[PDB]
């Protein structure tokens, strides 16, 4: 209806047509495809980058290119959609309309190898999230990456993953032959100005540019480009700002204080208080940080008996420490008996002092060394 819901709709965090931040990468991928078409030679490629950097959007924009649609056969396979690692031959046979005798994976592999031996168009096999094919033996991934070396085969394949060195770590044997090792292409994370241009393209797509002045965009991009650099978190904070401001103001452009509050937002019971204070006291006074549940419960009971508050038994104390584990202050290493579970504090002590906010009780518990 109004500009706020239009902005919240148009940010959308979904598949697009224009990619302003990826211009050299798309030209490089087009040059790779055109140079391997014009020589009619096969070539592997492994593109990588941080999650949210523009890989799947680029290679979905290029699998709708009409000239590459006419010159070669495009195949897209997402690799979390397979029931097992060896089912990628079945999925590729289903995507290429091959006729198999069936009911063994080796016959699907033979059908793909016969389909690569003869040809009429070049094959483009894009395997997205290729880290899901990695196993112990890696017969599947080494079988797939050897298809450019197959005689007469014309498949040029692209593997997309998040790991910068997956072809070096999990494909060590491909370095032994220069015919086989894939050309690498890193997708670097977005800077400040690239995220600014992505916002200014997505807002000019529906002419809703007046909601964001440039200063708040250059603050939000300055934080998100420094934290992770992906555009999904940038568009998520940019959508959350507008959906908070619509709740707040119901045409007012979003202020710097609103995006600052949302950015610092993104980037207790009594017995849990008494448990956290005794854990801080036991870690401060003792250099052995291997605290068991029974050894913590014994100090907790004396601290409670000093303040004349009725203490829980071991059975309620275990559930209390389990509820403090959910907040992220602790990590409980599990053992064979519940008395022997190991509590590990995962905050520094000043965060606990600021989170409990009961310094009159905290200073009283930390000064009582004698109950340990």
């Amino acid at each position: 209806r109004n500009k706020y819901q239009n902005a919240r709709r148009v940010l959308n965090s979904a598949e697009t047509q224009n990619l302003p931040g990826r211009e050299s990468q798309l030209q490089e991928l087009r040059e790779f495809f055109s140079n391997h078409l014009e020589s009619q030679t096969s070539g592997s490629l492994y593109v990588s980058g941080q999650p949210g950097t523009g890989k799947t959007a680029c290679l979905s924009l290029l699998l709708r290119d009409p000239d590459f649609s006419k010159r070669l056969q495009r195949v897209y396979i997402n690799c979390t959609s397979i029931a097992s690692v060896g089912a990628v031959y079945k999925k590729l046979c289903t995507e290429l309309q091959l006729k198999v005798s069936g009911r063994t994976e080796r016959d699907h592999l033979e059908a793909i190898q016969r389909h690569l031996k003869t040809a009429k168009r070049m094959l483009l096999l894009v395997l997205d999230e290729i880290d899901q094919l990695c196993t112990s033996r890696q017969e599947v991934l080494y079988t797939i990456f050897e298809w450019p070396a197959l005689p007469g085969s014309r498949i040029l394949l692209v593997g997309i993953a998040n790991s910068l060195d997956l072809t070096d770590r999990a494909l060590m044997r491909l370095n032994a032959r220069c015919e086989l090792k894939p050309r690498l292409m890193h997708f670097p994370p977005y800077s400040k100005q690239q995220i600014v241009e992505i916002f200014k393209s997505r807002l000019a797509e529906a002419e809703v540019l007046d909601v964001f002045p440039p200063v708040t965009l250059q603050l939000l991009a300055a934080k998100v480009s420094a934290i992770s650099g992906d555009v999904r978190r940038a568009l998520d904070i940019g959508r959350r700002v507008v959906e908070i401001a619509e709740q707040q103001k119901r045409l007012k452009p979003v202020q710097v204080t609103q995006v600052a509050a949302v950015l610092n937002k993104v980037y207790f019971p009594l017995q849990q208080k008494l448990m956290l204070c005794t854990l801080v006291l036991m870690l401060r006074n003792e250099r052995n940080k291997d605290i068991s549940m029974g050894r913590l419960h014994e100090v907790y009971r004396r601290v409670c008996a000093k303040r004349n508050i009725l203490a829980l038994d071991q059975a309620e104390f275990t559930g209390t420490v389990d509820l403090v584990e959910t907040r992220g202050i602790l990590r409980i290493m599990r053992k064979k008996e519940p008395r022997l579970h190991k509590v590990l504090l995962q905050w520094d002590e000043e965060e606990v002092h600021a989170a409990l906010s009961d310094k009159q009780l905290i200073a009283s518990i930390l000064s009582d060394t004698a109950c340990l």
């Binding site: 941080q50 910068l164 060195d165 044997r173 032994a176 670097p188 992770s228 995962q346 520094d348």
Partner: protein, 285 residues
């Protein structure tokens, strides 16, 4: 070769000669077929790579018989793969049983039904990386004992007959041949079984706050010539380089993944000497 025990207690023209050597070993092939006819097996124990000689034997002589070439220098073959290969591809009998000696029992009972169907078995590097246990050599000795199956093999490791006892050596009816070529091990050492620049290349891929965390680690290691987790967390929270503890833990786990920080018990050392860390810190300023 008669070794002395006192050493243990006190502690071009070449290509033409190699071609003449290879022709001389190429002359042995009818005698090898005559030897394989009488139930013996061929074993080669020369210095260099004998891959090309066995490939030339399979090409020039055994161009019409059933042949199972087994690359034992492959770092990822299993004896189950070779047994399934025999059972499914030669005999069309499906996948072999999961216990390998029962699979060799079924291979013997099936090959006893079909005489005059010889299976030649060419195992490059019989002492290969996954055939060096007692079980795979027991399987291969039980396979070579079959009169239909004829075996050729190569050995390169010097400690190879330590895993053959007298029963395996009686099943392996070997005829030993000194096929010493001087060819280098190109294929056999190519596999997986046999840094400042990488640090810079993975450092260019990190974001700004990741670079700042790593510069804090570098500055601490250069000042003290392994830093604790609490000092790193305090220095990260001071410069606002992290939001909480768990993001720093995930970032340091990512640092362990790309081989930049080594964790010890939290001690976080960089496995790089101090002068290169000083030149690297001058590179970032």
């Amino acid at each position: 070769f008669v070794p002395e025990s006192d050493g243990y207690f006190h502690s071009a023209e070449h290509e033409g000669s190699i071609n003449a050597i290879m022709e001389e070993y190429r002359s042995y092939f009818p005698k090898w077929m005559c030897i394989l006819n009488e139930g013996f097996n061929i074993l080669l124990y020369g210095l260099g790579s004998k891959h090309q000689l066995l490939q030339s034997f399979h090409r020039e002589v055994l161009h019409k018989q059933t042949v199972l070439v087994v690359n034992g220098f492959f770092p990822s073959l299993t004896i189950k793969d070779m047994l399934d290969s025999i059972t499914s591809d030669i005999l069309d009998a499906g996948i072999s049983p999961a216990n390998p000696h029962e699979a060799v029992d079924m291979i013997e009972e099936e090959f006893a039904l079909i005489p005059e169907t010889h299976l030649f078995l060419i195992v490059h590097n019989l002492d290969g990386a996954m055939l060096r246990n007692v079980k795979a050599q027991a399987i291969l000795s039980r396979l070579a004992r079959i009169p239909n199956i004829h075996l050729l093999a190569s050995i390169d490791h010097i400690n190879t007959p330590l895993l053959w006892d007298q029963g395996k050596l009686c099943s392996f009816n070997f005829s030993w041949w000194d096929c010493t070529t001087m060819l280098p091990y190109t294929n056999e050492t190519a596999f997986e079984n046999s840094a400042l620049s990488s640090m810079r290349s993975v450092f260019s891929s990190l974001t700004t706050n990741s670079r700042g965390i790593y510069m804090l680690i570098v500055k601490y290691q250069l000042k003290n010539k392994g830093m604790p987790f609490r000092d790193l967390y305090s220095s990260c929270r001071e410069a606002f380089l992290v939001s909480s503890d768990l993001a720093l833990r995930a970032q340091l786990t990512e640092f362990l993944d790309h081989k930049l920080v080594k964790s010890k018990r939290e001690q976080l050392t960089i496995p790089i000497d101090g002068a290169l860390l000083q030149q690297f810190l001058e590179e970032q300023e």
